[PDB]
Amino acid sequence: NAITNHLPTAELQALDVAHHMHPFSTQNDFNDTGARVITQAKGVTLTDSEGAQILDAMAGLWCVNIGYGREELADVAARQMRELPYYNTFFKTTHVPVIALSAKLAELAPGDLNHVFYAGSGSEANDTNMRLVRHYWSAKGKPSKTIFISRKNAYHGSTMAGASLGGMVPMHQQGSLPIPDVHHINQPNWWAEGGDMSPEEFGLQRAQELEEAILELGEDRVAAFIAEPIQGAGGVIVPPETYWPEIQRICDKYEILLIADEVICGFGRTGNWFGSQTVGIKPHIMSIAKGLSSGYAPIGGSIVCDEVAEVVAATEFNHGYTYSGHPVACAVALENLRIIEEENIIGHVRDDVAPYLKEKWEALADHPLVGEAKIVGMMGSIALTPNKETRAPFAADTGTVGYKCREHCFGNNLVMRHVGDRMIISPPLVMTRDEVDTLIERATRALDLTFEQIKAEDLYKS
Amino acid sequence: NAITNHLPTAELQALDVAHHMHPFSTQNDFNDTGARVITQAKGVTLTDSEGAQILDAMAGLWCVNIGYGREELADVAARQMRELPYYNTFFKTTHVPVIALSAKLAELAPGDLNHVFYAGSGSEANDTNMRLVRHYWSAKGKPSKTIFISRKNAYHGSTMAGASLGGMVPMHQQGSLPIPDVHHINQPNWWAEGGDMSPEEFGLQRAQELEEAILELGEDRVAAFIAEPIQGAGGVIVPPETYWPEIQRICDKYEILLIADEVICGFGRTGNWFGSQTVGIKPHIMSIAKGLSSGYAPIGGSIVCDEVAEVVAATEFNHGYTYSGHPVACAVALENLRIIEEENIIGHVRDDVAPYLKEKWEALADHPLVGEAKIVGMMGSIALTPNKETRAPFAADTGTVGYKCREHCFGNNLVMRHVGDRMIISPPLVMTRDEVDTLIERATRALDLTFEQIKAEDLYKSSSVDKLAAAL
Ligand SMILES: *Cc1c(COP(=O)(O)O)cnc(C)c1O
Ligand SMILES: *Cc1c(COP(=O)(O)O)cnc(C)c1O
Ligand SMILES: [Cl-]
Ligand SMILES: [Cl-]
Numbered sequence A: 001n002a003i004t005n006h007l008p009t010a011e012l013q014a015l016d017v018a019h020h021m022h023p024f025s026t027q028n029d030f031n032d033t034g035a036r037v038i039t040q041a042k043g044v045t046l047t048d049s050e051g052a053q054i055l056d057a058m059a060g061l062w063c064v065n066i067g068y069g070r071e072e073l074a075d076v077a078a079r080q081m082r083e084l085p086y087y088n089t090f091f092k093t094t095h096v097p098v099i100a101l102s103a104k105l106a107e108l109a110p111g112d113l114n115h116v117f118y119a120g121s122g123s124e125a126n127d128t129n130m131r132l133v134r135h136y137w138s139a140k141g142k143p144s145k146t147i148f149i150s151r152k153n154a155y156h157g158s159t160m161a162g163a164s165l166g167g168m169v170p171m172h173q174q175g176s177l178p179i180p181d182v183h184h185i186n187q188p189n190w191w192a193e194g195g196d197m198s199p200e201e202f203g204l205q206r207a208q209e210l211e212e213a214i215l216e217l218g219e220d221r222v223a224a225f226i227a228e229p230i231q232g233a234g235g236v237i238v239p240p241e242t243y244w245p246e247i248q249r250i251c252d253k254y255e256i257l258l259i260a261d262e263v264i265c266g267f268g269r270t271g272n273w274f275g276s277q278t279v280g281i282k283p284h285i286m287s288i289a290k291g292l293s294s295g296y297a298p299i300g301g302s303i304v305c306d307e308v309a310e311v312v313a314a315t316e317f318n319h320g321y322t323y324s325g326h327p328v329a330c331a332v333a334l335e336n337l338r339i340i341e342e343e344n345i346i347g348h349v350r351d352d353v354a355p356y357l358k359e360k361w362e363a364l365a366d367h368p369l370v371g372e373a374k375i376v377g378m379m380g381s382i383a384l385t386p387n388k389e390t391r392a393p394f395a396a397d398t399g400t401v402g403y404k405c406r407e408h409c410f411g412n413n414l415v416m417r418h419v420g421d422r423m424i425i426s427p428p429l430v431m432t433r434d435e436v437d438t439l440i441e442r443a444t445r446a447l448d449l450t451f452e453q454i455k456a457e458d459l460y461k462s
Numbered sequence B: 001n002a003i004t005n006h007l008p009t010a011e012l013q014a015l016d017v018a019h020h021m022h023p024f025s026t027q028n029d030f031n032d033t034g035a036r037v038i039t040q041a042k043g044v045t046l047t048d049s050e051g052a053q054i055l056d057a058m059a060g061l062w063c064v065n066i067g068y069g070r071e072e073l074a075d076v077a078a079r080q081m082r083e084l085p086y087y088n089t090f091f092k093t094t095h096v097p098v099i100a101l102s103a104k105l106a107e108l109a110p111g112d113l114n115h116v117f118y119a120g121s122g123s124e125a126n127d128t129n130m131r132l133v134r135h136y137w138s139a140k141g142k143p144s145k146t147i148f149i150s151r152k153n154a155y156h157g158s159t160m161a162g163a164s165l166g167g168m169v170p171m172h173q174q175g176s177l178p179i180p181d182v183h184h185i186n187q188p189n190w191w192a193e194g195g196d197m198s199p200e201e202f203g204l205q206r207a208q209e210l211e212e213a214i215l216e217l218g219e220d221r222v223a224a225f226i227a228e229p230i231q232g233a234g235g236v237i238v239p240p241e242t243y244w245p246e247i248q249r250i251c252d253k254y255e256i257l258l259i260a261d262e263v264i265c266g267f268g269r270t271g272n273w274f275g276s277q278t279v280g281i282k283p284h285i286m287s288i289a290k291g292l293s294s295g296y297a298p299i300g301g302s303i304v305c306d307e308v309a310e311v312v313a314a315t316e317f318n319h320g321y322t323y324s325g326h327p328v329a330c331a332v333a334l335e336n337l338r339i340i341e342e343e344n345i346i347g348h349v350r351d352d353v354a355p356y357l358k359e360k361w362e363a364l365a366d367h368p369l370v371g372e373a374k375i376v377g378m379m380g381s382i383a384l385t386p387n388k389e390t391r392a393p394f395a396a397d398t399g400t401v402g403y404k405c406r407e408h409c410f411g412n413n414l415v416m417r418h419v420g421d422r423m424i425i426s427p428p429l430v431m432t433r434d435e436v437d438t439l440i441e442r443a444t445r446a447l448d449l450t451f452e453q454i455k456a457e458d459l460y461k462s463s464s465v466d467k468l469a470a471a472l
Helices: A009-019 A071-083 A096-108 A122-139 A160-165 A199-217 A243-253 A275-279 A306-313 A327-342 A345-366 A400-411 A433-457 B009-019 B071-083 B096-108 B122-139 B160-165 B199-217 B243-251 B275-279 B306-313 B327-342 B345-366 B400-410 B433-456 B464-471
Strands: A036-042 A045-048 A053-055 A113-119 A147-151 A182-185 A222-227 A257-261 A285-288 A300-305 A370-376 A379-384 A417-419 A422-425 B036-042 B045-048 B053-055 B113-119 B147-151 B182-185 B222-227 B257-261 B285-288 B300-305 B370-376 B379-384 B417-419 B422-425
Touching: A009 A036, A009 B096, A009 B113, A036 B096, A053 A433, A071 A327, A071 B071, A096 A113, A096 A300, A096 A327, A096 B009, A096 B036, A113 A122, A113 A306, A113 B009, A122 A160, A122 A222, A122 A257, A122 A285, A122 A300, A122 A306, A122 B122, A122 B160, A147 A199, A160 B122, A160 B160, A182 A199, A199 A222, A199 A243, A222 A243, A243 A257, A300 A306, A327 A345, A345 A370, A345 A379, A345 A433, A379 A400, A400 A417, A400 A422, A400 A433, A422 A433, B009 B036, B053 B433, B071 B327, B096 B113, B096 B300, B096 B327, B113 B122, B113 B306, B122 B160, B122 B222, B122 B257, B122 B285, B122 B300, B122 B306, B147 B199, B182 B199, B199 B222, B199 B243, B222 B243, B243 B257, B300 B306, B327 B345, B345 B370, B345 B379, B345 B433, B379 B400, B400 B417, B400 B422, B400 B433, B422 B433
Parallel strands: A147 A182, A147 A222, A222 A257, A257 A285, B147 B182, B147 B222, B222 B257, B257 B285
Antiparallel strands: A036 A045, A045 A053, A113 A300, A285 A300, A370 A379, A379 A422, A417 A422, B036 B045, B045 B053, B113 B300, B285 B300, B370 B379, B379 B422, B417 B422
């Protein structure tokens, strides 16, 4: 039997759990609940192997920025695969797709971020960052500058390096992690960690932790601060207005590289080409992936400022991947950016859908179960809480209420994910206002069903 | 901002060096000589932006196994990209391409290798292996088993972990590497490191370093031994006949996982589906990429054995990449595997081209510059030497002669690379006998030119200490 969309879902699910190990999963869970089989997608809508139509408020995995079914990219890939499906960039060799895409990326990246080292993923781009930066500081005559400073509940990939830069304890527990010279300061999540400080003062305190970490560890030991402009996988944590201005102040004062992990935030997600632009900072390096190709072809990379590139360009840089700059991926990514740029999809975000989504998403704070509704551009979160006044957590294991809401969302044909007891959305940037209404309608029904179930099941308390 | 094939080569090269940071390079010597722009390819032939045609004896980067120009992979990618160009396998969700690819890999991987964890590259596959294997020994109640044992001059990728697991000193010197709990033993390269030992004695000694390492580190600390069946990037080092059987028997003595890095050797390269079949080992995990999709789309992974997958299957495995199982990459890899299987390309290697290429390649040992010619399946190397009898290296820094030979190759429209003073080839598996003939004629002319050049440069010499040792 050939394995196609024509096989019964149950049969496909058996083959799935028998041979395909899923990311971030307990694989045995698939014996009880088989994996949902997505077979097609168009616009913002997915269809599963039973014909159900799900609104994908997560855009695949924060990445399908131009939405599904844009055929220009499939035409661009086929044409590239026919002419030159692959050649390497190792042999003093190059091709037009990576040349074109590198010039395009330099143009879009603000300031002197004008050079791209290519990777397959956001994880591999942050491996590049670790190796590039340490080599950079040695080449500058300061090889003791090795420490990357990150944050608890940051997420920077799933390689050995990526997982170590992220701040997920569960990830650190697997692989003898973190790798040496990776440190973590606290995250600017006011709702859960703010105490009774104002958001504004809490944002200052959390930013100041970078200067204290520098002084504690020694400036001669610190290589870089790496951070998501807005934490994505941590639960769409929007920092207070005070946070990034004080980070920038600290980075301006001390000899440290600022690494904006733009893997989720890049390419329109926050209303600008880069989250760095939105929050007002000036990184020396940006990690990119995901929205770079709207997820249609695997590709990521590091955009690097002139000064770092110049110093390393005088050295043999012994790093890189067989698929670095893969011509087809580059051709797909370039068409993605043309479609975002020339159809003004970022304008569509800034002026049309994001203001509408904001008004609707922030009104969910009116729901009894929702203590706060945070959103920038097209990434948003809601904290579910048993007490809005105390901002308290539920008594149950953090994520029990989130999981119930998540299940109610999917059962109501909407892709909204939980991180603990926050729910998160990251819909395609081409989403229209009428589509926002459906999202809000289904999110509200799922939130009501979670409320009643929690009440009935005795889980509404702190 | 319109950059296309129509632009002059000189202009394209200026944009390249200005914005494109090349892997494994000194970016600045692109200011000296700009990059060769490859514009198209078909079969085994590259064309560059000036119309020059190059026989690609390296198959892109050890990966274009079905050769260039297979428009089926484009049709499959396009059709997958219109139907479902991306979905994630993170949300208790899946899709048909990753399901079918996994079932095909489980059927092709011998024995109980029946489970695939997907990556984007061979490097990410090895990051998976480190996190998976350490987590597995911890799940088994033995958390102290963390040390990956690897080899010098091994190559296992370029992530923090891939670079660490490889054995390239220049790679260790960038990133504060190797990361902890990685140990390196010596490599089975008899030509350069054999001393006065016979090859098969040397083979046993080199494999015995694995037990020596295990015993000096402690069985309670060791988690895995990882190794390429045949070292590729280190210069296609074919171990002596004794080497892999002893490794295997050492691994069967100890609680240790054998990981075969099949990123190069996999999918026909050595005359079998996997280099482990050819060298006769039973790995617990195989790392895959390159030939998996014939490089037409980026994808990698780890093929995992039943007992390791099942141990982990009972735990939340907090690992994975957005593009793990990417539906277009899978569809392409599947079609690649279909073509390899249904057109019997491995049979074409085994019975037609590999024996012909072996005959002709090993005859290169008759060349006055060549000291040895080693080939398994469709990967080969030759050692360039000033003295065949002693195997003594050139007096000039290692790679001086290899580099000169590489240049004569590219001047003869042949992609033959050097690793130190070895030349290496890894041609597309669908290479025909007439294409072998062109390869060898070009390779032989490049050997001839190299030979008379270094002779004129006064570089055809071992060290004066090695020349005196010619006193027999
Ligand atoms: C998704 C994520 C990554 C991981 O990139 P992969 O392609 O999954 O390896 C890295 N950084 C950030 C900020 C991410 O959100
Ligand atoms: C090429 C190589 C790798 C790395 O694969 P990438 O796709 O470049 O990350 C790993 N192992 C071996 C043996 C390799 O040759
Ligand atoms: Cl929270
Ligand atoms: Cl040698």
